[PDB]
Amino acid sequence: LPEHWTDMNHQLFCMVQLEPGQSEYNTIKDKFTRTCSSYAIEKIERIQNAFLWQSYQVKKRQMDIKNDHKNNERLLFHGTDADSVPYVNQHGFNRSCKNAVSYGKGTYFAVDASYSAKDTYSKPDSNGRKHMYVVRVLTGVFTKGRAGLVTPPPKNPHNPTDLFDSVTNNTRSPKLFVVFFDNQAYPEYLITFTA
Amino acid sequence: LPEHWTDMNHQLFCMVQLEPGQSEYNTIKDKFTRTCSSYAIEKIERIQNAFLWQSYQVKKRQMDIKNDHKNNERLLFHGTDADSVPYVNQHGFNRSCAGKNAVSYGKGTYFAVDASYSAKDTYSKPDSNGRKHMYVVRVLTGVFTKGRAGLVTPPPKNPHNPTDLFDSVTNNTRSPKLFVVFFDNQAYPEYLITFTA
Numbered sequence A: 001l002p003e004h005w006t007d008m009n010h011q012l013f014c015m016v017q018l019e020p021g022q023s024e025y026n027t028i029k030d031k032f033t034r035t036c037s038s039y040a041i042e043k044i045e046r047i048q049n050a051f052l053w054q055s056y057q058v059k060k061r062q063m064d065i066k067n068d069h070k071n072n073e074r075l076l077f078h079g080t081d082a083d084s085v086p087y088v089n090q091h092g093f094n095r096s097c098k099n100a101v102s103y104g105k106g107t108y109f110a111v112d113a114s115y116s117a118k119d120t121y122s123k124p125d126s127n128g129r130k131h132m133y134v135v136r137v138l139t140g141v142f143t144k145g146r147a148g149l150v151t152p153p154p155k156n157p158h159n160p161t162d163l164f165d166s167v168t169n170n171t172r173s174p175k176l177f178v179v180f181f182d183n184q185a186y187p188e189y190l191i192t193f194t195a
Numbered sequence B: 001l002p003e004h005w006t007d008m009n010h011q012l013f014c015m016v017q018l019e020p021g022q023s024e025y026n027t028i029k030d031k032f033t034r035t036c037s038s039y040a041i042e043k044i045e046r047i048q049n050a051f052l053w054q055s056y057q058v059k060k061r062q063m064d065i066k067n068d069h070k071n072n073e074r075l076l077f078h079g080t081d082a083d084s085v086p087y088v089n090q091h092g093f094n095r096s097c098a099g100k101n102a103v104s105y106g107k108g109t110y111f112a113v114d115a116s117y118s119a120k121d122t123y124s125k126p127d128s129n130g131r132k133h134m135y136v137v138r139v140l141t142g143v144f145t146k147g148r149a150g151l152v153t154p155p156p157k158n159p160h161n162p163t164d165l166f167d168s169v170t171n172n173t174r175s176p177k178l179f180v181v182f183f184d185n186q187a188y189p190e191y192l193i194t195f196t197a
């Protein structure tokens, strides 16, 4: 388990509220304020989920072998409703769980926090609180998505089981990625914020 | 990787044809013929898929820790069409590709206790040469309950703690004949039986 995690008294799941003004909080807040500087941050939590981390790291090691390079991970954003937050913290992102799915039936992740900050995604709750994850995503080798995909396309129609790792809206200048498998995304931080 | 697998000389995938009279072949044939005595096996292949095995074994270890001393794994059957076999061999069972079952206990991947169920033409569709295809699958059934057609994940054990889930669902908890799983890497395709009438 990562060095920057804090001790969990022999437990496997903890949400740790970050200390404002320390390097870790500052780094995550800056990623958010790059595009969401008009919002108000209530708190940032580090998600320490040993099981989800384990499964994700196995997939990363496999994708690093398959792709023969270690440039397969991106840090992306995911806005969701308050009622989904406990599920994501414990189980991560589930493609089987309203919004447009124009690039395929997977879990969507934004390059810019401002996109995930839309009320359609980070739905404000009874109190006006909005919720956005900072997510480690194994985007790997990607291609343009399209409606109705249930997996990424093959890299070559001649070898139909050798797949792209993810899809995007635009390969030259991506603003969203879609992944189609359990444990290709690790929810690393939860930002609680208002407009 | 299991020590009795063939050496794949650094390759990550291969299908190994088994020999009749070996215990490994005979136990699978016996498990199949217990309910499919009218069909005849062409061949049995051991599926050696390093990446699927790694991710499955991680999930098994997690479930064994979480459930504390449950037998979490069952050996079940899955009939499918020839067009799906390359994908399953490489990538396993994808709930997003699964058909609606004639009796639906949820939107997931279905596995049968009896080979006879998987042997129905509706699952193990005969190909253009009359070959039918059935996997023998290690499935992490864990702690289960009776499913419902509307499920896209197993239900919670307790409605006041919605994130603490059953591992799988079944048609009948007293006499299970099918199980449904809703997550990737909860089922390892271990053998492929090719068979005919």
Ligand SMILES: O=c1[nH]c2sccc2c2cc(OCc3cccc(Br)c3)ccc12
Pocket: A077, A078, A079, A080, A099, A100, A101, A102, A103, A108, A109, A110, A115, A116, A117, A121, A122, A176
């Ligand atoms: O942060 C997100 N959270 C959630 S919760 C349900 C969908 C999304 C989403 C979709 C996203 O893209 C959907 C989409 C799909 C097609 C065109 C355009 Br533009 C945008 C991007 C980010 C998120």
